[PDB]
Design a protein around this ligand. Sequence first.
Ligand SMILES: CC(C)(C)[C@H](NC(=O)C(F)(F)F)C(=O)N1C[C@H]2[C@@H]([C@H]1C(=O)N[C@H](C=N)C[C@@H]1CCNC1=O)C2(C)C
Ligand SMILES: CC(C)(C)[C@H](NC(=O)C(F)(F)F)C(=O)N1C[C@H]2[C@@H]([C@H]1C(=O)N[C@H](C=N)C[C@@H]1CCNC1=O)C2(C)C
Lengths: 298, 295
Amino acid sequence: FRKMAFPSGKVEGCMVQVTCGTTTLNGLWLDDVVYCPRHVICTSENMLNPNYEDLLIRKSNHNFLVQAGNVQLRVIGHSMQNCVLKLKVDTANPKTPKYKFVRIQPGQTFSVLACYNGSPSGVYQCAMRPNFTIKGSFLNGSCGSVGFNIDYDCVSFCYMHHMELPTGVHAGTDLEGNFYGPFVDRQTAQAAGTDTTITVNVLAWLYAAVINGDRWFLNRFTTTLNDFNLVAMKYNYEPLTQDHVDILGPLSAQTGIAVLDMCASLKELLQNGMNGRTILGSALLEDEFTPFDVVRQC
Amino acid sequence: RKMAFPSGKVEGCMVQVTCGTTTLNGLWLDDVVYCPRHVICTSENMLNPNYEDLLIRKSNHNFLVQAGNVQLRVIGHSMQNCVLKLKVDTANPKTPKYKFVRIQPGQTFSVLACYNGSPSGVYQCAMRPNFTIKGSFLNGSCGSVGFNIDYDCVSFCYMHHMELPTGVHAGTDLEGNFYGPFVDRQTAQAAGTDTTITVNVLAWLYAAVINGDRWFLNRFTTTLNDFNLVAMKYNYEPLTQDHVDILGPLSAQTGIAVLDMCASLKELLQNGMNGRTILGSALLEDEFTPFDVVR
Ligand SMILES: CC(C)(C)[C@H](NC(=O)C(F)(F)F)C(=O)N1C[C@H]2[C@@H]([C@H]1C(=O)N[C@H](C=N)C[C@@H]1CCNC1=O)C2(C)C
Ligand SMILES: CC(C)(C)[C@H](NC(=O)C(F)(F)F)C(=O)N1C[C@H]2[C@@H]([C@H]1C(=O)N[C@H](C=N)C[C@@H]1CCNC1=O)C2(C)C
């Protein structure tokens, strides 16, 4: 059971390089618009507390250099939507996929296409943490890289990368420029809140363990949502809702293990540990697989 | 994070190959489709297939090749070790710059898992020392390929053929020669005992020092032989002088001598992590190569 990213070719064909003055990052080129983080119009001097409304009025089309591989794109218009810059360009991308912009919830997963200088570098699978950060791998120049899901040739863009927090986790917006989490696009002191484990994803991962070989952690017992939720808080675990139980229903129906019975397994694992046994070859409990992820893979 | 390569250059080469009732994936490069030769097997042939006798009875029109909605015309065919090479009517217009390479255990690569010719997911892999892949491959995944990409040239190194009973996977290079002692035949065969890729753990430890963690270092050193005598008690691969030379650059960039990093690994194996993590893991990661670390 591997963590898998979506195939990235539909997105690779949209990545471009955006340069404003001395600042270069990545942009997303869909039809005749290029989307990128608005802090590209910041001068490094003004990363501390910029006024984006003012800095953009003073910009003109000629302040933006957009490069698609070998080819320079001519910017013919610019505007802002929340924290993303929208650069209208000369040419529609002939590789534009069927796509939509969506906003995801903490605990959902997506693929990230990490890019540098407009050129795709690698792909990995991520989860939006309960504290609204991403445990990604982003280096200098990675801003504007996007995250996405694919459903039957339709790309759902859900994330654009903006910044790294002092604990090495990452923060970004949806493609309409709304931040995930209580962060702002400026170099001021900010930090991730204390993170928590995504309970519904651990359970889904335990179902995947049962779907494969592993069954030793099953027991005769069952809990209640209220009794399990007291256990969850003690171990820094997101509380489990009736909504989570309902979505795990398919896996509970397929494997014959009710969710509150799996919770009994999980509560038991959280207290007594694994006693030298493993689950899908892992010694810790994995929480970056959603229920849909497990159904899809299996 | 362990990252796969962007998969688009390979997605444009995946096709569907059908022969009778068997369908799997093929790789379409220029005017040749490559795929596993057991596409020409039926039910009653998996146990003891005679591939020469099965192939002699086929003609070009027995092979149905589909690239998306378009049927390709097969105009020739031949067998090279355990891969079939289907000469087609049309050169793939999306053929990337590519080459074929055979890799060694410990090497990493990306896998594009496909079903019925359409890409489903991409993940990053290592060739294990027992010549198997710890992959994620379902019923129709055969013919999925593994690859690296360097300066826009795609190095194809793996094509998927079989699942072993332990859940791991075996396959061939793109010339059809199996990695390890496996055969494309449904008989009792089993992966040998697997071991940890020691040179990859050490390279990763060097990556931890470079990103500013040093908690696992100690003041000891070790001889190469003493290191290997301890490490093999944990099912770690022996470290060779070639591996030592290979880590040299990282040892220079960090100032930590290779054998001093070996002493730290012996201690990590002795103690565990005591609830800590090194890069982002509570496990010793062995699927990032020395070459990977510098990049
Ligand atoms: C880490 C740093 C101290 C530099 C800063 N962090 C914080 O200001 C915080 F602590 F508030 F998060 C930060 O990321 N930025 C400062 C400045 C932009 C952003 C930035 O340079 N983004 C990079 C875009 N290519 C990607 C970064 C590069 C390192 N790894 C990444 O992912 C803006 C928030 C406007
Ligand atoms: C797992 C099974 C017991 C069926 C068998 N294994 C062994 O015979 C062994 F144990 F000896 F390896 C096995 O894999 N095959 C039997 C037959 C082909 C191959 C096969 O069906 N390949 C699939 C290609 N689409 C991919 C497989 C599907 C399951 N998961 C995969 O990855 C050949 C070896 C000629």
